[PDB]
Design an enzyme around this catalytic site. Structure first.
Site, PDB file in Angstrom:
ATOM      1  N   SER A  21       0.529   6.823  -2.072  1.00 30.48           N
ATOM      2  CA  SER A  21       0.520   8.220  -1.668  1.00 30.48           C
ATOM      3  C   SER A  21       1.025   9.111  -2.805  1.00 30.48           C
ATOM      4  O   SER A  21       2.141   9.628  -2.761  1.00 30.48           O
ATOM      5  CB  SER A  21       1.207   8.474  -0.328  1.00 30.48           C
ATOM      6  N   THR A  91      14.231   3.875 -10.209  1.00 33.31           N
ATOM      7  CA  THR A  91      14.919   3.288  -9.061  1.00 33.31           C
ATOM      8  C   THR A  91      15.025   1.783  -9.247  1.00 33.31           C
ATOM      9  O   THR A  91      14.361   1.210 -10.115  1.00 33.31           O
ATOM     10  CB  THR A  91      14.255   3.595  -7.701  1.00 33.31           C
ATOM     11  N   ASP A 158      12.322   5.404  -1.226  1.00 35.69           N
ATOM     12  CA  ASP A 158      11.558   6.651  -1.298  1.00 35.69           C
ATOM     13  C   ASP A 158      12.356   7.830  -0.754  1.00 35.69           C
ATOM     14  O   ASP A 158      11.778   8.767  -0.215  1.00 35.69           O
ATOM     15  CB  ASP A 158      10.170   6.552  -0.662  1.00 35.69           C
ATOM     16  N   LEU A 159      13.683   7.748  -0.885  1.00 32.00           N
ATOM     17  CA  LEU A 159      14.512   8.936  -0.866  1.00 32.00           C
ATOM     18  C   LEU A 159      14.062   9.820  -2.025  1.00 32.00           C
ATOM     19  O   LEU A 159      13.498   9.341  -3.006  1.00 32.00           O
ATOM     20  CB  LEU A 159      15.970   8.500  -1.006  1.00 32.00           C
TER      21      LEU A 159
HETATM   22  O1  LIG Z   1       7.385   3.455  -2.729  1.00 33.29           O
HETATM   23  N1  LIG Z   1       6.568   2.558  -2.595  1.00 33.29           N
HETATM   24  O2  LIG Z   1       5.712   2.571  -1.714  1.00 33.29           O
HETATM   25  C1  LIG Z   1       6.583   1.446  -3.556  1.00 33.29           C
HETATM   26  C2  LIG Z   1       5.685   0.417  -3.317  1.00 33.29           C
HETATM   27  C3  LIG Z   1       5.622  -0.670  -4.175  1.00 33.29           C
HETATM   28  S1  LIG Z   1       4.455  -1.956  -3.848  1.00 33.29           S
HETATM   29  O3  LIG Z   1       4.008  -2.460  -5.115  1.00 33.29           O
HETATM   30  O4  LIG Z   1       5.062  -2.868  -2.921  1.00 33.29           O
HETATM   31  C4  LIG Z   1       3.057  -1.177  -3.041  1.00 33.29           C
HETATM   32 CL1  LIG Z   1       1.524  -1.833  -3.719  1.00 33.29          CL
HETATM   33 CL2  LIG Z   1       3.078   0.581  -3.365  1.00 33.29          CL
HETATM   34 BR1  LIG Z   1       3.141  -1.540  -1.111  1.00 33.29          BR
HETATM   35  C5  LIG Z   1       6.460  -0.774  -5.273  1.00 33.29           C
HETATM   36  C6  LIG Z   1       7.364   0.232  -5.529  1.00 33.29           C
HETATM   37  C7  LIG Z   1       7.436   1.361  -4.693  1.00 33.29           C
HETATM   38  N2  LIG Z   1       8.399   2.371  -4.965  1.00 33.29           N
HETATM   39  C8  LIG Z   1       9.836   2.200  -4.706  1.00 33.29           C
HETATM   40  C9  LIG Z   1      10.542   3.545  -4.662  1.00 33.29           C
HETATM   41  C10 LIG Z   1      12.025   3.379  -4.331  1.00 33.29           C
HETATM   42  C11 LIG Z   1      12.398   1.909  -4.243  1.00 33.29           C
HETATM   43  C12 LIG Z   1      11.971   1.153  -5.502  1.00 33.29           C
HETATM   44  C13 LIG Z   1      10.469   1.277  -5.739  1.00 33.29           C
END
Ligand SMILES: O=[N+]([O-])c1cc(S(=O)(=O)C(Cl)(Cl)Br)ccc1NC1CCCCC1
Length: 271
Positions: A21, A91, A158-159
């Protein structure tokens, strides 16, 4: 290696680890600590000047947060390369996926795991809501609850990003249609929005499907949510105690929802 912070502290690697997103996430490094981080680029799309003001302030408050069930926030800045502007957030790197990926991968969640993980979500939320001033997540979902391992703990992530995901904005009908708390559509929210979102998460973890899948678009969802029509998957919750908690969390009227205190005090949430 394809990037660095202004201060050289953080490097970005050519290793994309998430895409979603309106962001792309890369593996990175804290050169100061020599520990790996997530380098998230909020994608060539415009933030408002007002959002940027709020964000400078937020990022500084997030850098201070520690709790076992919250993903750590290191630092943030505006970055460009070629014709693409982003905001970078760095993060804590979460390498074992999300509740969404867990449900995808292993079709079912055992009740003792459900109980423990839900208690951890509640502890995380209690922590945020009790900061002074309170932090309201406003965008909790299964895909932003991260696991430290298949056998580990959950951390809410995702704060910050929730500020840039814009409840009262017009949006395209594309991908999977989303719900949120009734009052959220009008940006007239408090902590109880997180309780509603928690309820929805619990429902998903209990049923291994996204609520309201019987709706084709977000307008149908809006009409059902703001008229007190429950998702069909509610009726599929096997364990009555779990169903009862969900029902008390996802009340249409915010004033009738469980408080986090009451949920943590519920029979279910002691072993
Ligand atoms: O915010 N996501 O939706 C997110 C998804 C993935 S994933 O590879 O699992 C996917 Cl393919 Cl987006 Br489901 C990796 C990192 C992130 N961001 C995080 C933001 C804050 C915590 C640390 C990283």
């Amino acid at each position: 290696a394809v990037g660095m912070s202004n201060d050289g502290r953080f490097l970005k690697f050519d290793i994309e680890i998430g895409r979603g997103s309106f962001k792309t996430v890369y593996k990175g490094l804290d050169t100061e600590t020599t520990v790996e981080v997530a380098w998230c680029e909020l994608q060539d799309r415009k933030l408002t000047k007002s959002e940027r003001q709020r964000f400078k302030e937020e990022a500084e408050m997030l850098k201070g947060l520690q709790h076992p069930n919250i993903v750590r926030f290191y630092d943030s800045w505006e970055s460009t390369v070629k014709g693409k502007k982003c905001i970078v957030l760095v993060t804590e790197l979460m390498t074992s996926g999300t509740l969404k990926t867990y449900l995808k991968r292993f079709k079912v969640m055992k009740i003792k795991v459900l109980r423990s993980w839900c208690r951890q979500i509640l502890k995380g939320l209690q922590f945020l809501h009790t900061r002074t001033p309170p932090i309201i997540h406003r965008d909790l979902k299964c895909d932003n609850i991260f696991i430290t391992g298949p056998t580990g703990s959950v951390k809410i992530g995702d704060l910050g990003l929730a500020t840039l995901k814009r409840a009262s904005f017009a949006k395209a009908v594309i991908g999977t249609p989303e719900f949120m708390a009734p009052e959220m559509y009008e940006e007239k929210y408090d902590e109880s929005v997180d309780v509603y979102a928690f309820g929805m998460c619990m429902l998903e973890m209990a049923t291994s499907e996204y609520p309201y899948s019987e709706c084709q678009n977000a307008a149908q969802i809006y009409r059902r949510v703001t008229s007190g029509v429950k998702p069909a998957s509610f009726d599929k919750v096997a364990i009555p105690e779990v169903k009862e908690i969900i029902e008390g969390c996802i009340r249409q009227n915010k004033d009738e929802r469980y408080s986090i205190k009451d949920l943590l005090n519920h029979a279910f949430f002691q072993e």
